[PDB]
Each structure stands twice: as structure tokens, then as C-alpha cells.
Design a protein around this nucleic acid. Structure first.
Ligand SMILES: Nc1ncnc2c1ncn2[C@@H]1O[C@H](COP(=O)(O)OP(=O)(O)OP(=O)(O)O)[C@@H](O)[C@H]1O
Ligand SMILES: [Ca+2]
Ligand SMILES: [Ca+2]
Ligand SMILES: [Ca+2]
Length: 341
DNA sequence: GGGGAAGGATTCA
DNA sequence: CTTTGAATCCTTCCCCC
């Protein structure tokens, strides 16, 4: 099959440039402020002008400002980004009915029935890029290959504002020369476990005892990597349906006082119920981040949908359970809804 | 023995 | 004193449907 993956470039920061054109060419840093003190929080994303200097996703705002004190720092406006995203995703549906929106700035299109070979696929990619740029003024990077994993890898290799095809021969080459830590789904934790087994390339996963691999990184990831190594990886492009929606918020001051936490929890519940919109959850989990950054949760599943009134009384019961089964103080508190009707 | 659901922790991004 | 949303993975346990 032929897969065409679209990845919006430094998306949040690019949208802010689209809304304020004079920002282009200047380092722009979109931040997620937490409210614990002046500039507390981290960078959500930065444009390349900022990344060039080390200011990137994940570094503390305070740190970023030490590197680029005169950069433009903007608060994250997720709603705006989500609406621009939605409009771009609609443009993409016009190129294939088989589309998988993987996130706010990523989507896979199965274009097998639209093009005959990679040359045509490439031309369709330029067409898609021109279209998005024309309608929304947003640049994207297109990756094209035989399956979702290599289509994503192609985009990783070509971003920003690029387009790349990874034909069958290059797939075989990558299976031998690509750093396994660069394979989608393999984060830091897994990359290190793999490194401790002397595995640095997909190909390496074949010449090892399966139970040794499975025992180290889990059965699912082991089978996943081996299938990629056997060039036998296959996963169809399917419509994504979110399976859980929730919100967890950092508090003013750590605590284990029920009456003092209710407000924050109820806040997360109202914001969660807003995002649900029509979706009716049968399950609820209360999640707490401890003073020392540990994450603990308690949940419950009901035989029917959970009205917000039910969510309110039940969340307290679940938070009480955590408070009781854990001596530590809570830093962050939130709720998570799932098992939608 | 193993399907399948539920409760939690882990991992990815 | 870095976010923080969501899927994935690991155990346990019921049940023989
Ligand atoms: N610790 C983290 N590591 C990686 N991604 C994170 C983390 N915390 C949040 N994210 C979310 O992931 C986004 C980064 O994912 P990813 O690396 O796939 O984006 P991208 O398309 O490469 O990046 P960009 O938007 O910066 O151009 C941001 C947000
Ligand atoms: Ca992106
Ligand atoms: Ca992304
Ligand atoms: Ca833990």
C-alpha cells in the first residue's frame, strides 16, 4: 500500500506567526505557564529560529529566557491551534477517505487507491502542501512510504517544510542503518533498555532470543520491532476515536486537605465535561501527582453513563481513597473519563 | 488454560 | 521547583457464558 503522512511544522508557534506575520523570522516560543511563580512552567514549542539556539519543547521558561531573553514568549492558546488544525484536517479528507488523525498536527492518509506509484504519490504530496499553504498559510512536511511507520520516519527526515519518499530499497537500508531510537513508539525508556542488549538497529532485533527481548521491553514492543525488522509490519489506516478525555491541574500549594483540593478537582471536572461534549463516560479515574512527582490514581466503572452529578460525588470518593491509601501530599490533581457510550 | 474486563502504573509525545 | 493529554502495558481476578 502507499501511505502519505502529514506533519504540521512547529505547529503552535507557526499558527502564532500566521496570526501575527511580523513574528516571522524572529524566535517565537509558545509557553505553558503553571502559576507557581514568575515564569514557572515549560516551553510547549518554539519555531526553528528559537530551536537553533537550544530553546525547545520541554525546557523551563526560566531557562529559555536565559538563552534567548529577547525572544517573543507567548502563552499557549490551544483552542486556536485546535481550530486551525481542524480546518487543515478537513482539507486532507479531500485527498483520501481513509485518513487517520493521530494528533493535533499529524495525520496518515492511505492513498493506495489514489496513486499508482511513488512518483505520483510525491506529486500528490506537493499538491497537498500547496493546498494547505494556500488556504491556511501553514507549511507542513510530507512523508511517503509503504506503511505508517516509514511514512512518519520519512517526515522526520525531511522536516521542516519538506517532502520525502522512502521507497522499498531505502526501507531495507533503514532497517539496517537507522538508529532504533528513532523508530516511532520507541521513547527514551525503551531506547535505553534496547541499548543494554546491544541493539542499535532494527535488524539487531532478529538475532536475539525473543523471550529475552520480550522480557526486557515487553511483548508488544518486541513483536512490533521484529515485524518492522522482518519488513512485515502492517497496520491499516483507521479512523481515530479518542478513548479518554480528562484534565489534571497543578495546585497553588501542595496539600492533603480534602476541602482544599475539591475546588481544583471540580475545576478539572467542569473542563473535562466541556471537552466531552455529548460523549457519555461510563468510567472515571481520579489522578493525583504527589509532592515528589509520583503519579497515583483510583478509578471506577459504572454500568451506565456518568451524569456530572455522579462525577462530582464519585470523584470525591476516589480522591478520598487516594488520600487514605497514600500519606504523601498532593501537588497535582485531576480527573479522567473513558468508556464512552 | 486463557478470554476478557477492570484497576493502576508506565510510557510516549 | 518543567506540561500535561492520552494510549499502552502489566496484574489480578472472575469464569467456564
Ligand atoms: N516530554 C515530552 N517529550 C516529547 N513530546 C512532549 C513532551 N511533553 C509534551 N510533548 C508533546 O509532544 C509534542 C512533541 O511531539 P513531537 O516530537 O512528535 O512533535 P513534532 O511534530 O516533532 O514537533 P514541533 O511541533 O516542535 O515542531 C509537544 C507536546
Ligand atoms: Ca509537527
Ligand atoms: Ca506533533
Ligand atoms: Ca509510580
Amino acid at each position: 500500500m502507499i501511505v502519505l503522512f502529514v506533519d504540521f511544522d512547529y505547529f503552535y508557534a507557526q499558527v502564532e506567526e500566521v496570526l501575527n506575520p511580523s513574528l516571522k523570522g524572529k524566535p517565537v516560543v509558545v509557553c505553558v505557564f503553571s502559576g507557581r511563580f514568575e515564569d514557572s512552567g515549560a516551553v510547549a514549542t518554539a519555531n526553528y529560529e528559537a530551536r537553533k539556539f537550544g530553546v525547545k519543547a520541554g525546557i523551563p521558561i526560566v531557562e529559555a529566557k536565559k538563552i534567548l531573553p529577547n525572544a517573543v514568549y507567548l502563552p499557549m492558546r490551544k483552542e486556536v491551534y485546535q481550530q486551525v488544525s481542524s480546518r487543515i484536517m478537513n482539507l486532507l479528507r479531500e485527498y483520501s477517505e481513509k485518513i487517520e488523525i493521530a494528533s493535533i498536527d499529524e495525520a496518515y492518509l492511505d492513498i493506495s487507491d489514489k496513486v499508482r506509484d511513488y512518483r505520483e504519490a510525491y506529486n500528490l504530496g506537493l499538491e497537498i502542501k500547496n493546498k494547505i499553504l494556500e488556504k491556511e498559510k501553514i507549511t507542513v512536511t510530507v512523508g511517503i512510504s509503504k506503511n505508517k511507520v516509514f511514512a512518519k520516519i520519512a517526515a522526520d527526515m525531511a522536516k521542516p517544510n519538506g517532502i520525502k519518499v522512502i521507497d522499498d530499497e531505502e526501507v531495507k537500508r533503514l532497517i539496517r542503518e537507522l538508529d532504533i531510537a528513532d523508530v516511532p513508539g520507541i521513547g527514551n525508556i525503551t531506547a535505553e533498555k534496547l541499548k543494554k542488549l546491544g541493539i542499535n538497529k532494527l535488524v539487531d532485533t532478529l538475532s536475539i532470543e525473543f523471550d529475552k527481548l520480550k522480557g526486557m521491553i515487553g511483548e508488544a514492543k518486541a513483536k512490533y520491532l521484529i515485524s518492522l525488522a522482518r519488513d512485515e509490519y502492517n497496520e491499516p489506516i483507521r479512523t481515530r476515536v479518542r478513548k479518554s478525555i480528562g484534565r489534571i491541574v497543578t495546585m497553588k500549594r501542595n496539600s492533603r486537605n480534602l476541602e482544599e483540593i475539591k475546588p481544583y478537582l471540580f475545576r478539572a471536572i467542569e473542563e473535562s465535561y466541556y471537552k466531552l461534549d455529548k460523549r457519555i463516560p461510563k468510567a472515571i479515574h481520579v489522578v493525583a501527582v504527589t509532592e515528589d512527582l509520583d503519579i497515583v490514581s483510583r478509578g471506577r466503572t459504572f454500568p451506565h453513563g456518568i451524569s456530572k452529578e455522579t462525577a462530582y460525588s464519585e470523584s470525591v470518593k476516589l480522591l478520598q481513597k487516594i488520600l487514605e491509601e497514600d500519606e504523601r501530599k498532593i501537588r497535582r490533581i485531576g480527573v479522567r473519563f473513558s468508556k464512552f457510550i
